[PDB]
Design an enzyme around this catalytic site. Sequence first.
Site, PDB file in Angstrom:
ATOM      1  N   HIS C  56     -14.852  -0.956 -67.847  1.00  0.00           N
ATOM      2  CA  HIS C  56     -15.090   0.245 -68.635  1.00  0.00           C
ATOM      3  C   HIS C  56     -15.014  -0.018 -70.129  1.00  0.00           C
ATOM      4  CE1 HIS C  56     -14.410   2.139 -64.765  1.00  0.00           C
ATOM      5  NE2 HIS C  56     -13.162   1.700 -64.741  1.00  0.00           N
ATOM      6  N   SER C  79     -19.715  -2.890 -68.874  1.00  0.00           N
ATOM      7  CA  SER C  79     -18.863  -1.881 -68.254  1.00  0.00           C
ATOM      8  C   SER C  79     -18.925  -2.024 -66.745  1.00  0.00           C
ATOM      9  CB  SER C  79     -19.316  -0.460 -68.625  1.00  0.00           C
ATOM     10  OG  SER C  79     -18.342   0.517 -68.265  1.00  0.00           O
ATOM     11  N   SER C  84     -18.654   5.269 -67.941  1.00  0.00           N
ATOM     12  CA  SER C  84     -17.320   5.128 -68.503  1.00  0.00           C
ATOM     13  C   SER C  84     -17.300   4.578 -69.917  1.00  0.00           C
ATOM     14  CB  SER C  84     -16.449   4.227 -67.627  1.00  0.00           C
ATOM     15  OG  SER C  84     -17.028   2.932 -67.555  1.00  0.00           O
ATOM     16  N   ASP C 134     -13.058  -5.483 -62.861  1.00  0.00           N
ATOM     17  CA  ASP C 134     -12.458  -4.175 -62.563  1.00  0.00           C
ATOM     18  C   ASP C 134     -13.314  -3.539 -61.468  1.00  0.00           C
ATOM     19  OD1 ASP C 134     -11.635  -1.529 -62.417  1.00  0.00           O
ATOM     20  OD2 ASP C 134     -11.030  -1.411 -64.505  1.00  0.00           O
ATOM     21  N   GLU C 159      -8.509  -6.020 -62.007  1.00  0.00           N
ATOM     22  CA  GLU C 159      -7.766  -4.894 -62.568  1.00  0.00           C
ATOM     23  C   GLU C 159      -7.307  -3.869 -61.523  1.00  0.00           C
ATOM     24  OE1 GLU C 159      -6.925  -4.410 -65.740  1.00  0.00           O
ATOM     25  OE2 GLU C 159      -6.544  -2.255 -65.979  1.00  0.00           O
ATOM     26  N   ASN C 184      -3.523  -5.511 -60.747  1.00  0.00           N
ATOM     27  CA  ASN C 184      -3.197  -4.151 -60.329  1.00  0.00           C
ATOM     28  C   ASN C 184      -1.738  -3.994 -59.938  1.00  0.00           C
ATOM     29  OD1 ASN C 184      -4.366  -1.382 -59.516  1.00  0.00           O
ATOM     30  ND2 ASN C 184      -3.168  -1.988 -57.723  1.00  0.00           N
ATOM     31  N   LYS C 189       1.374  -2.129 -64.318  1.00  0.00           N
ATOM     32  CA  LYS C 189       0.003  -1.680 -64.110  1.00  0.00           C
ATOM     33  C   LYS C 189      -0.007  -0.579 -63.057  1.00  0.00           C
ATOM     34  CE  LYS C 189      -4.452  -1.360 -63.187  1.00  0.00           C
ATOM     35  NZ  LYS C 189      -4.956  -0.569 -62.055  1.00  0.00           N
ATOM     36  N   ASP C 193      -0.406   2.740 -65.080  1.00  0.00           N
ATOM     37  CA  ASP C 193      -1.833   3.042 -65.141  1.00  0.00           C
ATOM     38  C   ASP C 193      -2.283   3.933 -63.989  1.00  0.00           C
ATOM     39  OD1 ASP C 193      -4.656   2.601 -64.268  1.00  0.00           O
ATOM     40  OD2 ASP C 193      -4.753   0.999 -65.771  1.00  0.00           O
ATOM     41  N   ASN C 194      -2.186   3.436 -62.743  1.00  0.00           N
ATOM     42  CA  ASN C 194      -2.781   4.177 -61.630  1.00  0.00           C
ATOM     43  C   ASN C 194      -2.207   5.581 -61.520  1.00  0.00           C
ATOM     44  OD1 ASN C 194      -3.306   1.455 -61.378  1.00  0.00           O
ATOM     45  ND2 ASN C 194      -3.692   1.604 -59.169  1.00  0.00           N
ATOM     46  N   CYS C 198      -3.758   8.693 -64.492  1.00  0.00           N
ATOM     47  CA  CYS C 198      -4.467   9.810 -63.885  1.00  0.00           C
ATOM     48  C   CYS C 198      -3.778  11.144 -64.185  1.00  0.00           C
ATOM     49  CB  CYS C 198      -4.594   9.561 -62.393  1.00  0.00           C
ATOM     50  SG  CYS C 198      -5.733   8.154 -62.072  1.00  0.00           S
ATOM     51  N   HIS C 318     -12.371   4.632 -57.377  1.00  0.00           N
ATOM     52  CA  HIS C 318     -13.233   3.709 -58.113  1.00  0.00           C
ATOM     53  C   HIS C 318     -14.727   3.958 -57.879  1.00  0.00           C
ATOM     54  CE1 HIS C 318     -13.990   0.191 -60.552  1.00  0.00           C
ATOM     55  NE2 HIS C 318     -14.983  -0.089 -59.719  1.00  0.00           N
ATOM     56  N   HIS C 377      -7.781   6.629 -69.283  1.00  0.00           N
ATOM     57  CA  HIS C 377      -6.357   6.630 -69.602  1.00  0.00           C
ATOM     58  C   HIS C 377      -6.141   6.459 -71.107  1.00  0.00           C
ATOM     59  CE1 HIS C 377      -6.157   6.349 -65.406  1.00  0.00           C
ATOM     60  NE2 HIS C 377      -5.615   5.152 -65.254  1.00  0.00           N
ATOM     61  N   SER C 385      -1.415  -2.344 -68.636  1.00  0.00           N
ATOM     62  CA  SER C 385      -2.452  -3.006 -67.850  1.00  0.00           C
ATOM     63  C   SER C 385      -3.042  -4.191 -68.598  1.00  0.00           C
ATOM     64  CB  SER C 385      -3.568  -2.006 -67.523  1.00  0.00           C
ATOM     65  OG  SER C 385      -3.024  -0.815 -66.964  1.00  0.00           O
ATOM     66  N   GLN C 389      -3.377  -8.280 -68.205  1.00  0.00           N
ATOM     67  CA  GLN C 389      -4.649  -8.998 -68.129  1.00  0.00           C
ATOM     68  C   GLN C 389      -4.635 -10.223 -69.030  1.00  0.00           C
ATOM     69  OE1 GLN C 389      -7.349  -9.145 -66.485  1.00  0.00           O
ATOM     70  NE2 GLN C 389      -7.838  -7.183 -65.509  1.00  0.00           N
TER      71      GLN C 389
HETATM   72  N1  LIG Z   1      -9.943   6.491 -62.184  1.00  0.00           N
HETATM   73  C1  LIG Z   1      -8.936   5.706 -62.560  1.00  0.00           C
HETATM   74  O1  LIG Z   1      -8.586   5.604 -63.745  1.00  0.00           O
HETATM   75  C2  LIG Z   1      -8.301   4.813 -61.525  1.00  0.00           C
HETATM   76  C3  LIG Z   1      -7.111   4.143 -61.813  1.00  0.00           C
HETATM   77  C4  LIG Z   1      -6.539   3.306 -60.870  1.00  0.00           C
HETATM   78  C5  LIG Z   1      -7.161   3.140 -59.645  1.00  0.00           C
HETATM   79  N2  LIG Z   1      -8.295   3.818 -59.378  1.00  0.00           N
HETATM   80  C6  LIG Z   1      -8.972   3.766 -58.027  1.00  0.00           C
HETATM   81  O2  LIG Z   1      -8.510   4.850 -57.255  1.00  0.00           O
HETATM   82  C7  LIG Z   1      -8.485   4.473 -55.853  1.00  0.00           C
HETATM   83  C8  LIG Z   1      -7.103   4.656 -55.277  1.00  0.00           C
HETATM   84  O3  LIG Z   1      -6.189   3.736 -55.893  1.00  0.00           O
HETATM   85  P1  LIG Z   1      -4.634   3.734 -55.534  1.00  0.00           P
HETATM   86  O4  LIG Z   1      -4.016   2.682 -56.361  1.00  0.00           O
HETATM   87  O5  LIG Z   1      -4.085   5.107 -55.555  1.00  0.00           O
HETATM   88  O6  LIG Z   1      -4.689   3.274 -54.002  1.00  0.00           O
HETATM   89  P2  LIG Z   1      -3.587   3.500 -52.868  1.00  0.00           P
HETATM   90  O7  LIG Z   1      -3.858   2.547 -51.722  1.00  0.00           O
HETATM   91  O8  LIG Z   1      -2.260   3.459 -53.504  1.00  0.00           O
HETATM   92  O9  LIG Z   1      -3.960   5.023 -52.434  1.00  0.00           O
HETATM   93  C9  LIG Z   1      -5.088   5.366 -51.619  1.00  0.00           C
HETATM   94  C10 LIG Z   1      -4.512   6.379 -50.671  1.00  0.00           C
HETATM   95  O10 LIG Z   1      -5.560   7.087 -49.997  1.00  0.00           O
HETATM   96  C11 LIG Z   1      -5.105   7.391 -48.694  1.00  0.00           C
HETATM   97  N3  LIG Z   1      -6.266   7.674 -47.857  1.00  0.00           N
HETATM   98  C12 LIG Z   1      -7.201   6.777 -47.409  1.00  0.00           C
HETATM   99  N4  LIG Z   1      -8.139   7.308 -46.665  1.00  0.00           N
HETATM  100  C13 LIG Z   1      -7.805   8.655 -46.624  1.00  0.00           C
HETATM  101  C14 LIG Z   1      -8.416   9.767 -46.012  1.00  0.00           C
HETATM  102  N5  LIG Z   1      -9.513   9.696 -45.245  1.00  0.00           N
HETATM  103  N6  LIG Z   1      -7.845  10.976 -46.199  1.00  0.00           N
HETATM  104  C15 LIG Z   1      -6.734  11.057 -46.943  1.00  0.00           C
HETATM  105  N7  LIG Z   1      -6.065  10.076 -47.560  1.00  0.00           N
HETATM  106  C16 LIG Z   1      -6.653   8.894 -47.357  1.00  0.00           C
HETATM  107  C17 LIG Z   1      -4.316   6.162 -48.269  1.00  0.00           C
HETATM  108  O11 LIG Z   1      -3.450   6.455 -47.171  1.00  0.00           O
HETATM  109  C18 LIG Z   1      -3.600   5.793 -49.577  1.00  0.00           C
HETATM  110  O12 LIG Z   1      -2.288   6.340 -49.619  1.00  0.00           O
HETATM  111  C19 LIG Z   1      -9.022   3.041 -55.800  1.00  0.00           C
HETATM  112  O13 LIG Z   1     -10.432   3.091 -55.585  1.00  0.00           O
HETATM  113  C20 LIG Z   1      -8.673   2.513 -57.194  1.00  0.00           C
HETATM  114  O14 LIG Z   1      -9.429   1.347 -57.527  1.00  0.00           O
HETATM  115  C21 LIG Z   1      -8.869   4.640 -60.278  1.00  0.00           C
HETATM  116  K   LIG Z   2      -8.711   6.908 -73.651  1.00  0.00           K
END
Ligand SMILES: NC(=O)c1ccc[n+]([C@@H]2O[C@H](COP(=O)([O-])OP(=O)(O)OC[C@H]3O[C@@H](n4cnc5c(N)ncnc54)[C@H](O)[C@@H]3O)[C@@H](O)[C@H]2O)c1
Ligand SMILES: [K+]
Lengths: 461, 460, 464, 462
Positions: C56, C79, C84, C134, C159, C184, C189, C193-194, C198, C318, C377, C385, C389
């Site tokens: 991103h 990106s 993004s 990422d 990432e 990650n 991180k 971050d996660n 959010c 993602h 973020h 994060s 890296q």
């Molecule tokens: N947008 C952002 O800034 C950002 C930041 C970090 C990660 N992410 C992305 O977000 C996603 C989640 O990351 P995470 O670290 O929370 O993963 P995680 O494994 O900690 O959480 C995913 C969760 O989804 C649940 N799940 C899976 N299938 C499901 C379903 N059908 N119904 C309900 N729950 C279900 C799992 O049980 C798990 O607890 C990934 O794709 C990650 O790459 C996005």
């Molecule tokens: K920002």
Amino acid sequence: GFTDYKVADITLAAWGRRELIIAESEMPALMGLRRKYAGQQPLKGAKILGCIHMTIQTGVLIETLVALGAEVRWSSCNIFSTQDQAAAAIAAAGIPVFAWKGETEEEYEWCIEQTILKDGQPWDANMVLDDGGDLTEILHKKYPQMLERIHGITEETTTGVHRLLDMLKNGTLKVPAINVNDSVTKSKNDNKYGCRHSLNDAIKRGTDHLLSGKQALVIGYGDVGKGSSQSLRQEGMIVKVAEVDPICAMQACMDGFEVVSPYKNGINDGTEASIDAALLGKIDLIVTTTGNVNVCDANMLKALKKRAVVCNIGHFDNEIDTAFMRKNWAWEEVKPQVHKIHRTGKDGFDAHNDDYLILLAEGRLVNLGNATGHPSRIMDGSFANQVLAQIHLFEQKYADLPAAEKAKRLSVEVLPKKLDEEVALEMVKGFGGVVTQLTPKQAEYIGVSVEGPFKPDTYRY
Amino acid sequence: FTDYKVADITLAAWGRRELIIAESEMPALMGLRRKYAGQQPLKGAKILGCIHMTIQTGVLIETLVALGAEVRWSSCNIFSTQDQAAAAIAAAGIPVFAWKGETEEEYEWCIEQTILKDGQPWDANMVLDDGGDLTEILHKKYPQMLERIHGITEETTTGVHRLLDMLKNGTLKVPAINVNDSVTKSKNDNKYGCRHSLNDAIKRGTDHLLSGKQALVIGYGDVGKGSSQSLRQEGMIVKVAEVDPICAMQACMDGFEVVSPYKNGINDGTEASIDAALLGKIDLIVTTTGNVNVCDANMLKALKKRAVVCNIGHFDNEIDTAFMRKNWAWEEVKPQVHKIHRTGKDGFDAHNDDYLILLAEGRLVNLGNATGHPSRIMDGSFANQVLAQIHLFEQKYADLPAAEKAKRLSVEVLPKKLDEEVALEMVKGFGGVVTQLTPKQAEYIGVSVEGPFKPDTYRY
Amino acid sequence: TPAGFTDYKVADITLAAWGRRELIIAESEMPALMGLRRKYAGQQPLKGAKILGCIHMTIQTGVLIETLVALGAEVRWSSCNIFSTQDQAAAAIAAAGIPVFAWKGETEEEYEWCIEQTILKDGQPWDANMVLDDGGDLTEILHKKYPQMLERIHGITEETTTGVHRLLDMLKNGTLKVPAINVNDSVTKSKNDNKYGCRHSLNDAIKRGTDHLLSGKQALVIGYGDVGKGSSQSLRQEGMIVKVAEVDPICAMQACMDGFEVVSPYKNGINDGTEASIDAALLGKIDLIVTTTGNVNVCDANMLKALKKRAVVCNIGHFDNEIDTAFMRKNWAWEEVKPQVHKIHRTGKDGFDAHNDDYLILLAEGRLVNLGNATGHPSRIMDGSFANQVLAQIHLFEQKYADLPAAEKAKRLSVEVLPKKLDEEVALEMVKGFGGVVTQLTPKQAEYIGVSVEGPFKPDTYRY
Amino acid sequence: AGFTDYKVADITLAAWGRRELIIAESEMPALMGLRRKYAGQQPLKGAKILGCIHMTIQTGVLIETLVALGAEVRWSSCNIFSTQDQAAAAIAAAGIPVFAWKGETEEEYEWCIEQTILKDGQPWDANMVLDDGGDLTEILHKKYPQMLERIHGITEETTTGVHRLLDMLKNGTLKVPAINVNDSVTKSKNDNKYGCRHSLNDAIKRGTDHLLSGKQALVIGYGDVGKGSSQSLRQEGMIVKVAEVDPICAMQACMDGFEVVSPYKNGINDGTEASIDAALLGKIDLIVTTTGNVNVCDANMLKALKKRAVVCNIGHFDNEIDTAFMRKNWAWEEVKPQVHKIHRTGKDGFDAHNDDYLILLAEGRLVNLGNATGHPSRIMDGSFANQVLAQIHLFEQKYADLPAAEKAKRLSVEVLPKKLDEEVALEMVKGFGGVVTQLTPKQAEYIGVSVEGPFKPDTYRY
Ligand SMILES: NC(=O)c1ccc[n+]([C@@H]2O[C@H](COP(=O)([O-])OP(=O)(O)OC[C@H]3O[C@@H](n4cnc5c(N)ncnc54)[C@H](O)[C@@H]3O)[C@@H](O)[C@H]2O)c1
Ligand SMILES: [K+]
Ligand SMILES: NC(=O)c1ccc[n+]([C@@H]2O[C@H](COP(=O)([O-])OP(=O)(O)OC[C@H]3O[C@@H](n4cnc5c(N)ncnc54)[C@H](O)[C@@H]3O)[C@@H](O)[C@H]2O)c1
Ligand SMILES: NC(=O)c1ccc[n+]([C@@H]2O[C@H](COP(=O)([O-])OP(=O)(O)OC[C@H]3O[C@@H](n4cnc5c(N)ncnc54)[C@H](O)[C@@H]3O)[C@@H](O)[C@H]2O)c1
Ligand SMILES: NC(=O)c1ccc[n+]([C@@H]2O[C@H](COP(=O)([O-])OP(=O)(O)OC[C@H]3O[C@@H](n4cnc5c(N)ncnc54)[C@H](O)[C@@H]3O)[C@@H](O)[C@H]2O)c1
Ligand SMILES: CC(=O)Nc1cccc(CO)c1
Ligand SMILES: Nc1ncnc2[nH]cnc12
Ligand SMILES: [K+]
Ligand SMILES: [K+]
């Protein structure tokens, strides 16, 4: 060939209309009035001078007044609060509107004057809708002959009400007013929850700063200060509150905030030595919420932590001594309505200077300046009250009363509680809430009518 | 000294240790002691007091006495007394008639012992009441005593309502101060006090986890606001019911789902009107209204098995406990905690799963299952009480000519400056620093530097 | 700055001065990352590193890029999402003479072309030796289409949760060609971050896209992992009534204890493929659905058919296939409100009534909403994060995996995390950035709990 | 009928305890599910369990689950203040040996543990240990090694006890394998965190009835207990500051919205009064220790605290606070049981109206159990379902019967498999009425799991 307007870019109108149509679905009390009163045309013959932030929400208000029979001429009550797509949509509907985001002070005044005058002469206005009192003041100072034919003023905000009450006290208020601010569905909805939504919104849009874990000082704990403090605390800020009103301070303590003064022992004696330097040097963000003057003064600004954010969500920018900053410090624009103020001196700055403050919206109302103000579903309450207030004063026809009867009606009043409750009920239904109906035995037991009002006028909620 | 009745006088030492602690928690009230001790503004006052005989009320009683008054005291609820507070007041030589766990008959006898001294009416000249029971008994049974009384100071929302009904009916005989409506009372006590003490009492009574469970709070006035927060801050999923749409709007904006026990909000008396799906998911119902029968028999029948039922309004008729006494079997768990077995009236299976848990037999749960509001909150309410007693006693209404009395017969609140002064001492108790306006700033907003800072219409 | 520089593609180069102003502010918000810049600049630990980067193209990534450069690296950047990029960040990086191919609002074709412009220089593979990724898209393209370039690459630093999962699948199937660090799952991180990222940026994005009041309305958050936890808090702190769906009972237990009602879109949790298995009463009261799972089709077509009129639909996982947007493109008419905000009219495919009440609002066309409708973020969170890296890049680059004999290569073909001591050092700089003061153990206290005074303070099994 | 093999405060409290146990059963679906699932199989038939854990109503349901699965037990509390006397009575009245009351002296505490170890003056034929904090484990290793020869394993409840087990393992002195029950996610991230969230402000309210809103708190520690404790106080409206030695935990405190401070200037604890941040501690109304460490609320901190501050500890052992210093130097005034005013005016006597005191809760022992009832049943459900599963696993493994070569391969400290952790969690979620979604096979394949779980790799932190 409609040309009786001035906006930034008329080609934004289609976008503005898309957003008005969404907002309509978020404003059930206001659209409910539109549907209820459209056949009756209770504002037929009304000619309203309106001065209030030209937002998408104000758009829905304008079009409700028009749908009920009014003609209007409109301006914004702040140089930075217009949403240009809203202004364009209103203009493209054939409604006179003079407003754009980023007016100068001269342009601001010219815009109000374009509502007051049509084709170079006083418009045949007979109603006023104001937010903060600037239009009201210009009419009293410069256009008294117009006020002779005006039936009333409906005023949106605390600061504007204070100005009306000053006129009433002095015997200079020329027409009656409704205080829209102090409906509960305005003051304890808009002023509080609106700022809860939109303060952290504007800070994020302006700076994208993380707020969690950082130190904030909120000056004031009235309705805006309550909502502002919650906007920051719910993000994880460590929020301290200043107040001059010990009852509001008590509320802040009980709400879980530490109550502090910028000044040692609270004594604002005008000296640098009176500043609590230890306190101010820890503050990452200061927000003024008072409606008062110079509550974030030059000495507080000198003492603030490097790179602190400074903003104001009260009605006028003089809550912060921006004049001092313009006189002494170098301003670097980051992007519109975001400035770094370099405390290293006046003549230029080092691009990598670390000793700066970030000022949002040049000290003007930050929620509207750096974001979009309150959300539609909150403004629904305020603007349903505005429409009802306009209907009430227009139907009363104060301008046509004999002198002896005018004297009996020259007042600043609020809407009756039954209307306040009916606005609230439409807001609750908009959330899908279900209000319970009292049984006859229960209504007798607490001494109310089943349809309300449910509280005496003294009740504070 | 024998002019008292408490559960156990030997608890006095314990009560006195807790009174000394509470004094350090009540800066507005102790400030009134220090400020008025010299003047003795209540010298000659003879106060009949009827309010929950807690440690907090002990500091109030001893303040009135420290300012010159004599008092005779009783509790205003059968379960709210703290026996160690009652003992400490009795041991101090102050007549008090109060214990935790009175019967209704004993409750009335206790009030009557304050009214009568040595078998005859005491020469009382002031009344301090909480809920209006003592006010009502004086008007109905001892009206001649009211000829000598200068005023009533009433603590709570329900009691104020009863005062206004008497005023409207022309049956109120002495002037009164509505203490409930000082901001440092209503918007401190009624809200924040319940925030502190509702979850407190539920935990003491049941030790239930609250997080993750579903609550229904009936009412969203000041008590319902504080009660809802008490539960939400613990992690309950709180739903709110209301008849007042403005209060309901506030509940929505505060993050609560607003629901009705009744389909479309219409309570027509039938079981069919009950939203059985909603009530079948509720783990805890709390009534906060000051109204009658807001947790009714059909709601109680529809509630989820093993739900908790309690009331934090002034009177127990918020819940139809009479229905439950008539139809279901009560199993005491411990004092003020009952399992109510919905299987039938005569006997129960000790392992029956179909029961409700009722706290404090439907009486004020915070005082019944815990200790009510904390000292630092009651500070505000009781500072107002002292000021109100001083004012009415000094006005000497009972000594006015009959015509002068007509102009004085009112229900008033204390002026805002005194409200602000109570608030200031509360803020100082937290270490908070209130800022002083400059003259120019006070001029700018149209107030005096001294205050009051808001018009009387302001709602905070 | 470099004379004649044309080795980039961005939306609008005149935004560069704006982007630079925001980078200078961001530097003050990223103490861990800027501490590494100051600590290692003289050592030049990345001298000779040639990094392909795919993440991103935000202001925060700009500070990361210029830290790698300050430590000696050359980079070529794209990106990892079509929506993004912050165009002023991309402009500032290009104006600095750094090859970057990124703008907000790419097509899928442009997205792939931007990655290929980093891989290729003057029509031939760049002599890259490091990868920073990422989500795994650049990793995948290298293995699938430029496998010979991997012979010279010392490692990948990945990432995000989805990217690590793809790396582990490759490692298990024997198809991963170079070692990798899972960035990650540093605690500074994943659990910064996660989750908190959010928390900050989900409500931010919804407000910018719709300006809807959130207080008092009903949300359904699908997933309660780190993103779901932070997303649920983002909405609950605004006063939403939030319900949580999960397949993981431990995560569901946390949601209950955190104060949320746990519910399934399907009756009894069972998707039987039919509309009858949808809990229509539940979905008919939801104002906002947010997918957070990293899984596929968790807000499916039948759920979308059952949602309350005018509900907002968005995804903060993602990849956009968490939501069946393909079904919506096939069956329903899209009306653009403004960029990355579409009303989806459920009245049919061919045109719409401008006043139709039966629409959903889709944000960012289903792509990561925080980056798509806001700025993702904040800098002070991305600090953690991106410090990880930099440390990951330094470690793998100094390891020189591609120069090892084949036997040593098999010994080092792994997916690893950074040591906890480094995670703690990143955390300490973050804490100091808030003005926080960490207490030092006395020797007797450190002996008592069995740690060094300097740490690490927890065993590797500790979950925080 | 003839049963005398117990010692409790008052056996006549048994009916009350039994009523509370029946309520607690309805609050503990995972534990009651284990009873139903395993009652027919009797997996603990022949198990003889020495149990040392807080003799609460919740422990009562645990004990009767073990007994319903076939075990015999002999029980004591692991803290002098944590027993609920009606729980101990209900258990004794059921014919189960229990030696526990609220308010034991230290001599009585040790005697109670010895009464479980010895039956009729000789070693009981114990073959299993359930422990909370390691005191029973330590006594067996130091004083009864011959008994450990016949013991198949230890299931240890809490962080502090696990640390002690790991020290033994490191030094080669641990004699039987153990399950670390603490570090199931349905224990550590349920009990340690959410249990303290529920029960800390509970105990402070019962002991002092102090308003917490608007007052200043200092929480020492931000592990699982410190996280739950800080929330307990923040959710009441306290202004909470957090101290930590672990910068990752401090990072979480910052991001969670707390100010992170140290009692020592620049965080440097050099033993001098000059090192104390007196301005900070002079503003603190409440200090809570959560560390499992020693002397984290020390004498100089105690001297500097704001007058009338509340001091308490929610870690396992009272040495987190220097109460010894306070006994040596300051005069203690009992307010009521487990609530003492500590008068800093001197050791010999006090003025009844002295303003310069601290309020210490539970004499520094675990405050949630000492001044209230500890964690609630529905939280303890998770911890104690793990306990039961861990007892079943170690007893079926029969370590004591293995040859020496096979013992050496099994001598370890382990956690339960994640699948069992998940199964405990699902019963907890069902208890709330929660509805978990079932993955389709394609979704399970997509994220690499079986539809029935486990859903996360063992490295996952939640
Ligand atoms: N947008 C952002 O800034 C950002 C930041 C970090 C990660 N992410 C992305 O977000 C996603 C989640 O990351 P995470 O670290 O929370 O993963 P995680 O494994 O900690 O959480 C995913 C969760 O989804 C649940 N799940 C899976 N299938 C499901 C379903 N059908 N119904 C309900 N729950 C279900 C799992 O049980 C798990 O607890 C990934 O794709 C990650 O790459 C996005
Ligand atoms: K920002
Ligand atoms: N930006 C918005 O959307 C928005 C919305 C509503 C109102 N407003 C404006 O915000 C301002 C405040 O409105 P309100 O309804 O909260 O009014 P209010 O009177 O309820 O509150 C103002 C508070 O500031 C306190 N205060 C005054 N001087 C102070 C000082 N020197 N230091 C500390 N505290 C001080 C007062 O005691 C009072 O409690 C007004 O100008 C109003 O018009 C803005
Ligand atoms: N237990 C305590 O410590 C304590 C403290 C203060 C007051 N009180 C008592 O609590 C009660 C409430 O006092 P308050 O100050 O909140 O009064 P209030 O008038 O502010 O609020 C009562 C609320 O109940 C609502 N209500 C009435 N009937 C209803 C119904 N059928 N369903 C739903 N909502 C309904 C009303 O609309 C109102 O908003 C009174 O009896 C008061 O004396 C108790
Ligand atoms: N009372 C209860 O019901 C209860 C429940 C669970 C655990 N516990 C006990 O509480 C204690 C803590 O358990 P936990 O699971 O939170 O452990 P933990 O390891 O998760 O947390 C302890 C924290 O204390 C911090 N710390 C250590 N020394 C410190 C110091 N001098 N200053 C500041 N912080 C310091 C550590 O960095 C660590 O993060 C243990 O004794 C455990 O057995 C009590
Ligand atoms: C193997 C096993 O018995 N798993 C399990 C865990 C918790 C509860 C239950 C039944 O409630 C079963
Ligand atoms: N503690 C208390 N004492 C007296 N009256 C009260 N009303 C509510 N709580 C109270
Ligand atoms: K808006
Ligand atoms: K308990």
